[PDB]
Amino acid sequence: NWFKITIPYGRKYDKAWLLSMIQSKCSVPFTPIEFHYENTRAQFFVEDASTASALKAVNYKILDRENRRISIIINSSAPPHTELKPEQVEQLKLIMSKRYDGSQQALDLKGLRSDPDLVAQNIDVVLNRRSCMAATLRIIEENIPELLSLNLSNNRLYRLDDMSSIVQKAPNLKILNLSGNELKSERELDKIKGLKLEELWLDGNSLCDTFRDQSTYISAIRERFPKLLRLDGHELPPPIAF
């Protein structure tokens, strides 16, 4: 089982110089495996743990041209050649800020694979993927926890178990647009029922065609969201109580 060695800022240094310095302080001979650059950082792999630990001891030991120390970060790992890069994520994070609105605390993520500035840099942003959605939601938690409205229409969403965590990341979310998607059953809603929504949009999804009468539809959903008030553009005949 493998380890991935990371030098933050390693692209800042001549490869030879860097590897030799490192070896110089390392207490064993080692060999870089599929050594590559990823943004400004240097990455390689290590076949065994004794080495890794030894590499690990070189942290803060090497000192650069500019009197800066050189960080070595060590992590257990799947073997080489095997998700989402930070420089990709930080671009995602960039685009969301763009489509974010502080005046109303509203994110807008409609048709996102089809975004110029993510397309323009070969970043497929595919929210129908568990890891891509997971990324989007950390970004939300980290940056705008007071998010209130969230448009997510036209993103071919098919399993909501991927936003299942949203109830904690976006506590006060109350407007959720899910129109123009690909959700088949109504059972999907059970994964996000904790949200005290006042607004909701579902049309365009094949679970709408489930219902014969719109008053069943509306009951089925208020089943999940009692406080619900608007839906698919329309006023809601107020809840009857018992």
- Domain count within the chain: 2
Q: Are residues 33 and 112 in the same domain?
A: no
Q: Are residues 40 and 118 in the same domain?
A: no
How far is the CA of 149 from the CAs of 25, 197, 199, 232, in angstroms? 53, 9, 9, 14
Q: Are residues 176 and 234 in the same domain?
A: yes
Amino acid found at 171: P
Q: Is residue 10 part of a domain?
A: no
Resolution as reported, in Å: 3.0
Q: Is residue 3 part of a domain?
A: no
Buried b (16+ CB within 10 A) or exposed e, 203-231: eebebeeeeeeeeebbeebbebbeebeeb
Q: Are residues 212 and 225 in the same domain?
A: yes
Strand partners, 33: 45
Amino acid found at 126: V
DSSP the chain: -EEEEEETTGGGS-HHHHHHHHHHHSSS----EEEEEETTEEEEEESSHHHHHHHHTTTTT-B-TTS-B---EEEEEPPS-----HHHHHHHHHHHHHTEETTTTEEE-SS-TT-HHHHTTT----TTSHHHHHHHHHHHHHH-TT--EEE--SS----GGGTTTHHHHSTT--EEE--SS---SSGGGGGSTTS--SEEE-TTSTTTTT-SSHHHHHHHHHTT-TT--EETTEE--PPP--
How far is the CA of 119 from the CAs of 71, 95, 136, in angstroms? 33, 11, 17
Q: Is residue 126 part of a domain?
A: yes
Contact between 52 and 74 (Cβ < 8 Å): yes
Q: Are residues 92 and 198 in the same domain?
A: yes
Domain boundary among 82, 101, 117: 82
Q: Residue 196 contacts by C-beta under 8 Å, 6 or more apart in sequence?
A: 172, 174, 225, 227
Q: Are residues 57 and 157 in the same domain?
A: no
Q: What is the CA radius of gyration of the chain?
A: 24
Q: Are residues 114 and 224 in the same domain?
A: yes
Q: Is residue 22 part of a domain?
A: no
Question: In CATH, what number is assigned to the domain containing residue 33?
Answer: 3.30.70.330
Q: Is residue 185 part of a domain?
A: yes
Contact between 61 and 55 (Cβ < 8 Å): no
Q: Are residues 126 and 237 in the same domain?
A: yes
Tokens 């110029």 locate to: 116
Q: Are strands 175-177 and 199-201 parallel, antiparallel or unpaired?
A: parallel
Q: Is residue 145 part of a domain?
A: yes
Q: Are residues 32 and 149 in the same domain?
A: no
Q: Is residue 14 part of a domain?
A: no
Contact between 133 and 162 (Cβ < 8 Å): yes
Residues of the domain holding 115: 83-242
Q: Are residues 49 and 117 in the same domain?
A: no
Q: Are residues 49 and 131 in the same domain?
A: no
Tokens 């008053």 locate to: 215
Q: Are residues 121 and 241 in the same domain?
A: yes
Which residue from 8, 66, 65, 13 is spatially nearest to 41, judged by alpha carbons? 8
Contact between 138 and 186 (Cβ < 8 Å): no
